[PDB]
């Protein structure tokens, strides 16, 4: 049977005996996600140059994720890649849902075109107390749903579930999220890596060493290839499909990486790990941090889990 | 005012006086263009997984069919055919069109953006139309340029006049020309190339890639960027300027790319912006070809950046 | 806020503390919608016409027909273009039976007149294993109806006992937007629709209820006429702009010509939902019982005021 | 082979060897249709109900500016304008046009099909550009038309060279040519128009509709379909055959319907496909138009239909 994104989330609903309430979050980021393909691939861009005689995409993103959950009914606390502190869903719209996102993850460079995506983690509110920022600084175990949209060369839709990863190819011509590739998971061993080495002057031996073994490999294997498109989102995904190994790694300059724990590594993370695959700051798994502010940053290595144990390996040979 | 692709390539045209072929040709093409846009994007998609109870070939098709129905081409070279395919006598037209479908296509499973690259040149001869009218160097081109179906889709054309970009916008199917007369920052701080291969890289190509990440002159080093389609990485190196790089290795010593529908076009937009495409050797728009498929190597981009590698590649001879 | 169909449906179904099984159906039905929406607007024809060198309504048909099957809500199907009910296959079964239209006036879409979809929700009555007879309900016993326009935009209007609701189809993203909320129509109107082509046929009581929307007796302003011949367009000015739609017996149609299961039923549903009115002239749309479920039955519907005149013009003549 | 607006356009521009001046005219009224479409199809209404947080004045404004900024045109005449517009000197290029952008849509709100309809003149004097130059009959026409945004959005443009029918395909923005050189049936089954005004009905149409519904003779009656949108009614008559009449009568001698931008296209249209239009009097082409806003009674279809309207008419007269 064909199935859509909202079918697929409605029975997975009925089977957990729900509300509701996480379906209704769900659907509303759906439809966020739709407005935003929409206008990355600039729909309507001939009005803007005078066809008939405006926000940046990252600003309209957003918006629009933001009006979209909280108009769901079902979030209280929202965190953004654009906003300096939490915001709090006003009482009449509070659900019990916490959302960290970063509405157009990439878009800095969004002048040549390049793949660009929104990443999302929802929790579960855990105290009882007046709803405040300090409800987002949860671990990434206590993830309910995460996953990501990617706009590439087409749109999709990753969702992670206790059930496992689904991905939902956006057909344009309809506006449905249409469910292509069930359960994934991803290699146990990949061939490429994917970080950037124009900072090559600044990298931590352990990570000099481990780039090095891929190009020299020392058991006569074939050396690695190398990508790096410098959009995460479009890098993670297209290390799920076809494995290998993702590193945004701490350095001398940058002891904490450069990435946003909350909703940058948090959600890609809890895909990896859904899809049997590792992610790591170096000395933990990335889903066990605990956060004390929004925006703090950390390193990340993730991907096949053969390639990120060689990386971990490397990384302890060096103390 | 808003212009089209369509009203400037017609405007274009009045103005060279010409007999409306090549913008029958240039507007079949765009025309393809969008209807491979529209497939990428997945449109209709929900009917192939059963709602109601191959893309580089469908790409391909496009083209040809498109290009043969402008009565404007008479051989028409492809990355996805053999030979050249040679256009029926009723259909001929006097222009040989070289184009990579969907470039990029191998690693589409994982929505990496691909693109569409055209080279056409014009058949002078009276002989009846062969594969060795395809075989011209780049500096007969008579326009070039690509498609890429990225985060949005953009067409880049290039000709006599410059550099245009216009940005499809799906809405009402039109290319809306959004960056006139573009020209490449002249000195970039990206460069761009498969440093998996660096076991194998030429000796020149190696030290080049040390003084981006050490500069000698205490700049910042570069940073890197591969997205491993070549239209992206090209498209960037136009916006943001810097240096594309596809050597020779182990596994390519003639490089990788094709010269006749890849580097050839690439070389010419490149050029037609105040940028450089060479082999090392030559400028790529200087090879003259002897096979349709043949590969050569291509470093491109900002002026001082390729400057700078021909420089390290003739300190090694 | 802002509200789509979507989100409408699912707080609809938390109110009513429902299973999820009615939400279920709709959304799928939605999804058909906007396929055929696609499909009508003729995205994809070029390819049709040989760019790289199924009917509409057998493909609005299949459309419909897959995405309620697989939606586990249905049971039973009733459609204009199957002779017989379908059978929902066992494992696939849910409690609702739908009777709909999948493209009707498509007998003139060769003119590009405004098509549409009309559909009608039941809850299975019998015990019985599932068969045609689970459709053979009067309209009193629908749980929702509507219809899909694909006019100049395309709109869903949504009918439950909640009220009337009308979304709009925003092709850009693929989303139903609500747009006028618990619609009323007006009590009385000032436009009249039928094929007066049939005047001959027409019994006295229509063809006195027409001369007085020429010629009125007080001498008020004549009334306006429309006449799209396609039941969706007609129906839908009729609820917007007020007035009234008749599509009575003819000589070529004694019985009527419209279709009591899935044209009448539904449109008398929606009408009687925002404050209109449906009758045959003898007794309310609604309260007919099927035989058959492709059964015809005259109709005259629209503003309460409008109808009611209508209704005393047909007393008069007995 | 598929052909496109845009192909054929510039194959009959190449045919005529012209300077290529009235297919930049047709090109931006191309565009300016898809984006009218578009708007009406509602893309981005959702924006407009606050997703984050009219439409026959846009059409008016996508009309206007494409017709200006296409170089082709000197004096726009629209419905939604009291005075002809006159295109500023630089822009000026030698073709009238007058247009409905969007006929019908006092209704707009019960999502009635719409349409556009334009009629294209070339300015007759050398005189400075004015209201004057649009006051030609139909006759001058050279090419005429209309966009239907009904269940599926389609052009239909005449020329010397006929009618031909255009789909729009939404996917990829391209008017696709699906109806080739159409001829209207000598004689129809269907009459259009609206009753509600019987009572003020001149005599001839009160005896005229008569005899369609009852048949003098064993004659079958004629069907009535009346949607109350010229363009939409207009359509079905080309399509199915019969009769659209919006007549004369003692309280509107002249009709209801406007001479330049509504009976003549409409009226050009028919004759190119083997119909009729009259005002009673005489050929609605033949009127020499004094008010660009002037009415006119229009009777169109079939020409069988035609003149048996004709015949009852003058059998009052
Ligand atoms: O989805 C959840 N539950 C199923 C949704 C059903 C609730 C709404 N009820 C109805 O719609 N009822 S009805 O009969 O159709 C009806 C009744 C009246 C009018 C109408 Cl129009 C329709 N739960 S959950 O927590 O979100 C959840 C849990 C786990 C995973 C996920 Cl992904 C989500
Ligand atoms: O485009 C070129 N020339 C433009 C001239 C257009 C030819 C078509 N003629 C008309 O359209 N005539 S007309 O009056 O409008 C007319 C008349 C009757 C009916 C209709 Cl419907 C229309 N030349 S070129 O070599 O292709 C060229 C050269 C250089 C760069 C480029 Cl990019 C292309």
Do not use: W
């Amino acid at each position: 049977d064909v199935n859509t994104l909202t079918r697929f989330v409605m029975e997975e609903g009925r089977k957990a005996r729900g509300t509701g309430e996480l379906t209704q979050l769900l659907n509303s980021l759906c439809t966020a996600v739709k407005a935003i393909s929409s206008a990355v691939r600039k729909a309507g861009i001939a009005h803007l140059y005078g066809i008939a005689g405006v926000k940046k995409l990252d600003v309209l993103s957003n918006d629009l994720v933001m009006n979209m959950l909280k108009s769901s009914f079902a979030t209280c606390v929202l965190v953004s890649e654009e906003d300096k502190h939490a915001i709090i869903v006003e009482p009449e719209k509070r659900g019990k849902y916490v959302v960290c996102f970063d509405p157009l993850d990439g878009s800095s460079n969004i002048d040549c075109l390049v793949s660009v995506g929104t990443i999302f983690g929802i929790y579960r509110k855990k105290s009882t107390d007046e709803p405040s920022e300090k409800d987002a600084l949860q671990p990434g175990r206590n993830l309910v749903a995460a996953g990501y949209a990617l706009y590439g060369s087409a749109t999709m839709l990753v969702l992670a579930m206790d059930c496992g990863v689904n991905c939902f190819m956006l057909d344009p011509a309809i506006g449905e999220f249409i469910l292509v590739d069930k359960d994934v998971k991803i290699k146990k061993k990949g061939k490429i890596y994917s970080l950037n080495e124009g900072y090559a002057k600044d990298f931590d031996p352990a990570v000099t060493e481990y780039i090095q073994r891929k190009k020299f490999p020392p058991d006569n294997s074939a050396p690695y290839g190398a990508r790096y498109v410098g959009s995460m989102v479009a890098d993670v995904h297209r290390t799920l499909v076809y494995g290998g190994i993702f590193l945004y790694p701490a350095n001398k300059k940058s002891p904490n990486g450069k990435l946003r724990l909350l909703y940058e590594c948090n959600p890609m993370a809890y895909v990896m790990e859904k899809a049997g695959g590792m992610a790591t700051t170096g000395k933990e798994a990335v889903l066990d941090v605990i956060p004390t502010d929004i925006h703090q940053r950390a390193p990340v290595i993730l991907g096949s889990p053969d390639d990120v144990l060689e990386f971990l390996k490397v990384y302890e040979k060096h103390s």
